[PDB]
Structure 1
Amino acid sequence: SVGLIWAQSTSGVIGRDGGIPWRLPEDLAHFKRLTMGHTVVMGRRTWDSLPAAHRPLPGRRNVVVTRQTGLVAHGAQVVGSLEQALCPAEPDAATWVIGGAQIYALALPLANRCEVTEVDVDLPPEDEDALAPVLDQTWAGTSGEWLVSRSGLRYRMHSYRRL
């Protein structure tokens, strides 16, 4: 059972300049709660983007997807494909794919749940941005209310399940 979890601007941006181009503490808390104790699968660029204090993510089984043979990711398990990441030698009840755009596209056919934070931030996409997946008609969801962050941004959470 594989879920994707991401935060996106309403315009669909998830990443810029090797990071996330807004600050949304309530999203960090949401992400922390959903993933603690579970497996988190990420692309190598997302692994390299992590803040020092969260590389690896504490209290979670970190898995990093790369084409590099012999890459070492201290504190994580390195695998060579998303399929390998979803075939662990030690099964986990809950596996979360935590980005980025390349790994989400590989993961979406294998997933049955998406947890999406939508951020009302004016971010006209730029040419090198990482963009969110778009969920087609095989997905249906439920939306929480629009809330205001202590940071000032409006945001809301969506939960999708494969039909």
Structure 2
Amino acid sequence: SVGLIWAQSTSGVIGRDGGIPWRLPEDLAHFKRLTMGHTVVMGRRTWDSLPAAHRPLPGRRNVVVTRQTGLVAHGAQVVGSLEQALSPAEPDAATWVIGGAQIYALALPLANRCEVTEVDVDLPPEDEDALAPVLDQTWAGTSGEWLVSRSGLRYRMHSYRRL
């Protein structure tokens, strides 16, 4: 089982200036609960985007997709393709693809689940933004109710499964 997990603004922004252009502790806790104990697969720019206290993501096997021989920053297992990241895989569990836009694009044809956090922040897409992947007719989805964060931002979760 291969799952994509991401947080996006309503406008579909996931990334800006090498990071995430909002702060949402409730999403981080959701991300922790779904990924803890599992393999997380990410592109190299997302690896470098991790704050130092979260690089590597503790309690998860961190696999980084790169075309380089290896990385200066420690704690990852490097692979040269998504296929190499995904096999062999943890039994009875999802392998989570955790971004960014380039690796979501590679992983979307292979995924059977998407877990999306939508953040009601007003972020018109800017020229160099990373955007969320668009899901096609092969996905069925359900949506949770709108929630309010302690910081006042409204957010909700969407869960998609491959038909």
TM-score bracket for the superposition, by shorter chain length:
over 0.9
1:60 aligned residue: 60
TM-score where L is the length of structure 2: 0.96
SS of aligned partner of 1:31: helix
Task: Assess, with a 3 A threshold, how the Cα gap between structure 1 residues 89 and 143 changes in structure 2: closer, same or farther.
Answer: closer
Deviations, residues 95-128 of structure 1 (Å, cap 9, x unaligned) = 0000000000000000000000001100000000
Deviations, residues 19-43 of structure 1 (Å, cap 9, x unaligned) = 0000111100000000000000000
Within 2, Cα distance between the matches of 1:90 and 1:155?
30
Residue 93 of structure 1: CA displacement?
2.9
Residue 74 of structure 1: CA displacement?
1.7
SS of aligned partner of 1:53: helix
Residue 72 of structure 1: CA displacement?
5.1
Residue 4 of structure 1: CA displacement?
0.2
SS of aligned partner of 1:29: helix
Task: Assess, with a 3 A threshold, how the Cα gap between structure 1 residues 152 and 74 changes in structure 2: closer, same or farther.
Answer: same
- Tell me if structure 2 keeps the 8 A contact 1:39–1:92: no
Q: Identical aligned pairs, as a percentage?
A: 99
TM-score where L is the length of structure 1: 0.96
Within 2, Cα distance between the matches of 1:70 and 1:34?
28
Within 2, Cα distance between the matches of 1:30 and 1:3?
14
SS of aligned partner of 1:107: helix
**Which of 61-70 and 8-17 deviates more?**
61-70
RMSD across aligned C-alpha pairs, in angstroms? Answer: 1.4
Q: Gaps spanning 5+ residues in structure 1: where? A: none
Residue 91 of structure 1: CA displacement?
5.8
Within 1, Cα distance between the matches of 2:81 and 2:91?
17
- Tell me if structure 2 keeps the 8 A contact 1:38–1:92: no
Within 2, Cα distance between the matches of 1:145 and 1:69?
44
1:98 aligned residue: 98
1:158 aligned residue: 158
SS of aligned partner of 2:117: strand
- Tell me if structure 2 keeps the 8 A contact 1:72–1:78: no
SS of aligned partner of 2:59: coil
SS of aligned partner of 2:91: coil
Within 2, Cα distance between the matches of 1:12 and 1:89?
30
Deviations, residues 112-152 of structure 1 (Å, cap 9, x unaligned) = 00000001100000000000001011101110000111011
- Tell me if structure 1 keeps the 8 A contact 2:62–2:76: yes
- Tell me if structure 1 keeps the 8 A contact 2:38–2:90: no
Post-superposition, which runs of at least 4 consecutive aligned residues in structure 1 deviate over 6 A? none
Residue 87 of structure 1: CA displacement?
1.2
Within 1, Cα distance between the matches of 2:2 and 2:114?
9
Q: Gaps spanning 5+ residues in structure 2: where? A: none
